[PDB]
Symmetry: D2
């Protein structure tokens, strides 16, 4: 019976916020419901772009933002002085484009930052390390629509009841299991994996200790593979290959938001040499290898890396 | 503008049917919508058991049914005499159990067969090779809901407009791509694959012709991985392993209906040694290893198998 | 559990129909859902024109239609030859215009007739007395959406479950109450009523038998006031006045279909001098005064009319 | 593009409210959407009571109330000390019961009050005159679902987009037309009307000045007849008859909330001798004759009354 609006509103009162951030989040939610309806093809009797147009618009109207970065735009959107609020938002309107046409789960990922600089708003305002995130999360358009919000005191999962257009709290304080039995990677790149990644895979299939082999799962949508990682445990890997030197997934709105959710839930997120949330961005569309999930599974792979010095 | 309701009514007419089989499809459709709405969690403020009850119940009220086989039931279900029809229906009420809790795509699989017999309806009526199907179909509850239906005439895809509860033809007389670039399998069983499967995988990662490697995709729900296979091309496979020697997927309401759809769409479906559609089942819950998808992809693998048997 | 889709398919079968007319109902249903969703303002974040386009378009794609008459069109619409069927359809796409803006109940009225002729389909095919209808029906977009359908066999009501886009039988073989207690008319035209209507009203407020006065109800939408009349009993009336001498409501897609439903349900429908169903129209947009509802109520009024003509 | 949540939230920030009232209104809205879905019979493949159970529950959880009065309960609901907020709410969960079964428009009416007394919460806390209302309004389940909210600075109309479960602002600052051409009453009681009511009707049908006669309309649901009055202008009348000496409609949750909406929109609401909002309630289920709508139409009838001294 507890709804996202009420949760968000409450959290607003504790913090003693002025109402801007709350406003922002209500706005986000609404955009998410408008995308969910669109993705379930209501009125079917473009998608990548509809999404973006929605997140941009509803965000601007929140009067809570000053800088926007979307995976759909070369340049940072600087907001009109008259709609200008204090937050910097980095979103991925519709994540999982390769999966759109085959009807497989796709999502929306976001990250909220606070204007640090005291100068005119600009792209550098979104080049803050993931560690500075105030809020981060995602909406999965799967069998059902779900919004996962992460904030300092934890990760919570709200189910969208499309009947009355309300997200309902379904999981109180998500924590990922210490150790899982599922691995996610696209193994199509085997020929260009680095030595650590290569050795890790072998262990998941031929465990030296003779334990059960991990199961494999890779939806092809970061948002779906990641959500499963949070919920079932296990590991997700989009490492840097020879064809994609710096990884494929993008730091600001794909790597950072999900890293934050992972740690806030007791998991880890690393590039293999460094915590993702600690990297200082040099480009709003930068890419960075990513490995995330159960603390023990990630740690194991890190040990292989240092072992490969 | 062409609704599924319209499509089936027209098809039944062109076939000069008595409407029983047309009723059947309508009922299967109504159930799909019902299952969809529940899966999307409308009214939230077990999913497998509900799906099953809906199908069993709808199929009975159809008055088109004589025998039913659910993956949810130890034994076939024989329809009471006042409600009997000439049709046998093999269904998997909700496929992709491992993905339910994590909100990934899941679906409903179905296959339909005419009674082959004069005698009291029994289990035996359900033990017909996939080649004998009248229609095979799957509903996918993914980003959007899709119902795919295959009949002697071809494969068609309909999207569910949840705004009006209607399925709308979106892709007509669908044909799978001859050769793809995406391979779908659970590599976790690697230690247990046979030499052919193993050789094949290596070949998707390290192509001898030095071309670009196939990309990998494996949702975990046979309805999801198969649908993508139909629409993007490529190949899907769930071969035999230790835990399941004979394959995991079930012949009657998993392999057969998908192999039917896949072949109507100009694709292949093999266990590795024979055509899935030609196996004569002897147990309604029988399992079978399966390889399906684009012709050149399954063929390449079949050649690896033949190459090993030939040695 | 009995859907409208199922009901019509079964009915068509029992009638041994070729399915054309069955297709027609399906198409009318699909349109109703479509109109409903628009009326409920889904996707908001002209209603009369949209309704019309939907119906005209759906009815044509049905391939069951030869001629169409819309209250929205100056002239009958003749269906192109490749899409022709044997059916003539008189419809009012959205009834209750005065109530649209204020969000009160509005609906869609329809009547269906077989072509009576050998000759090129024309307007003339639509000029058949209401007695000649195969089916008459109305969808009410009120608190909930309801589709009422009447055929030679009776009147049935189906509720729209918008969760699954399906109409569900809720009231079967409906029969209007013999005598009611609610009278429905626009008393604003009082200065212009004829002596009978006037006497009658006075009689509902000051009953000579000293019983309790009928209560008054008048929504302004003929679909709303008629539906209530069918379900609670009582009487509805829109007689002749100065601004409309011949009555306001239209014979073909307002009076006729409602009189058909009302009679199948054991009720009456008169202009005051004759049965609405028996008038032979001579203009597709012709008007007629109407009195309908419970038998004893319309009869009481008819007696007042006869009593004046007799003097 | 402006939603009820954002409007309500904003108004919250101007007033510099602590968030309780805002919370309350978000709660109300949600209850209203849950009733709308129920009334459109979603899941049909009791109503009077479902409604009440919803309004009670969601209101209690708002933590914004201390006293509730529903047309469905003999006694005032006094809220548990631990969920106790400062507001007193008077609602009519589902108005138009006689109309439920025939599918004709029905609604939900509410009125919000502020705890005046400093003693233990009790029924007297809801016996405040309508004039003290802080907020009042209604939700009409018609062809479409609409929420009309009235508050000190005006009346606004929000359309419920059932697609994404959001009310959308559709009318900025409602004002009723000075004069209408529609009258609403149940004329079935003609034999027990008082002289003023009787004479008024005659004028609407046989205007002495020979002008056009008013049209008649009476849905049978206060919420529908009243909403039409607001939107098209004209008059609505549920006068006291001989069979119902004090009127039928009830002061706290039927007469008062709609009076407030009417005045706040430039119209009038009277019992024929007195402004409705000025009556001091002596019972939570009291009844009081009501006449409301266009200022000129109501005033005309008042003149007949004083003329009938
Ligand atoms: N709705 C909310 N939920 C959680 N934290 C919030 C909320 N509103 C404000 N805060 C915290 O308080 C700060 C000030 O909020 P504001 O004045 O609304 O910008 C934010 O940076 C948050 O860290
Ligand atoms: N709706 C339909 N779509 C496709 N084929 C049909 C349909 N109805 C009947 N048929 C064909 O005609 C046969 C007899 O149908 P029935 O009389 O409905 O049992 C079926 O087994 C179908 O192969
Ligand atoms: N779905 C149906 N419901 C009721 N009667 C029908 C139906 N279909 C056909 N009939 C009866 O059979 C006649 C021939 O129908 P058709 O062959 O569909 O044009 C119609 O005019 C109806 O009176
Ligand atoms: N959301 C709101 N909209 C309009 N007025 C409000 C709102 N919140 C508070 N107010 C006004 O400010 C007072 C204090 O609100 P609160 O502290 O939230 O109880 C209320 O009695 C209202 O008169
Ligand atoms: O096909 P690949 O290289 O495995 O890419 C999969 C990834 O691509 C993305 O679409 C990034 O564009 C992610 O959403 C997903 O995780
Ligand atoms: O999890 P595994 O062993 O890879 O098997 C996955 C398969 O399980 C199934 O649920 C069959 O039971 C299929 O839907 C899916 O393809
Ligand atoms: O407003 P009036 O003149 O009372 O007429 C009301 C009638 O108008 C109509 O809209 C006919 O045009 C009917 O739906 C309704 O019964
Ligand atoms: O049938 P009557 O006496 O005109 O009552 C109509 C009124 O009754 C009520 O239902 C009050 O219970 C109102 O909603 C409506 O305005
Ligand atoms: Mg994107
Ligand atoms: Mg992305
Ligand atoms: Mg199942
Ligand atoms: Mg299955
Ligand atoms: Mg119209
Ligand atoms: Mg009309
Ligand atoms: Mg009530
Ligand atoms: Mg009431």
């Amino acid at each position: 019976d507890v709804t996202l609006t009420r949760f968000v509103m409450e959290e607003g009162r504790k913090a003693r916020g002025t109402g801007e951030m709350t406003q922002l989040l209500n706005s986000l939610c609404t955009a998410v419901k408008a995308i969910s309806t669109a993705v379930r093809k209501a009125g079917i009797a473009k998608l990548d772009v509809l999404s973006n147009d929605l997140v941009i618009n509803v965000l601007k109207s929140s009067f809570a933002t000053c800088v926007l970065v979307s995976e759909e735009d070369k340049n940072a959107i600087i907001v009109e002085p008259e709609k200008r609020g204090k937050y910097v938002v980095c979103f991925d309107p519709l994540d999982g484009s390769s999966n759109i046409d085959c009807l497989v789960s796709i999502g929306t990922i976001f990250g909220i930052y606070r204007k640090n600089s005291t100068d005119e708003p600009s792209e550098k305002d979104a080049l803050q390390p993931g560690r500075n995130l105030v809020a981060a999360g995602y909406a999965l358009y799967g069998s059902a629509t779900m919004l996962v919000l992460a904030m300092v005191n934890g990760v919570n999962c709200f189910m969208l009841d499309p009947a009355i257009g309300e997200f309902i709290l379904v999981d109180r304080d998500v924590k990922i299991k210490k150790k899982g039995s599922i691995y996610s990677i696209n193994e199509g790149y085997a020929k260009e994996f680095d030595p650590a990644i290569t050795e890790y895979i072998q262990r998941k299939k031929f465990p030296p200790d003779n334990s059960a082999p991990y199961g494999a799962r890779y939806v092809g949508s970061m948002v779906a593979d990641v959500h499963r990682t949070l919920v079932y445990g296990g590991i997700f890997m989009y490492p840097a290959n020879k064809k994609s030197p710096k990884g494929k997934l993008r730091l600001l709105y794909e790597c950072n938001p999900m890293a934050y959710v992972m740690e806030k839930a007791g998991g880890l997120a690393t590039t293999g040499k460094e915590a993702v949330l600690d990297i200082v961005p040099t480009d709003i569309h930068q890419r960075a290898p990513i490995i995330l999930g159960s603390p023990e599974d990630v740690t194991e792979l890190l040990e292989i890396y240092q072992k490969h010095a």
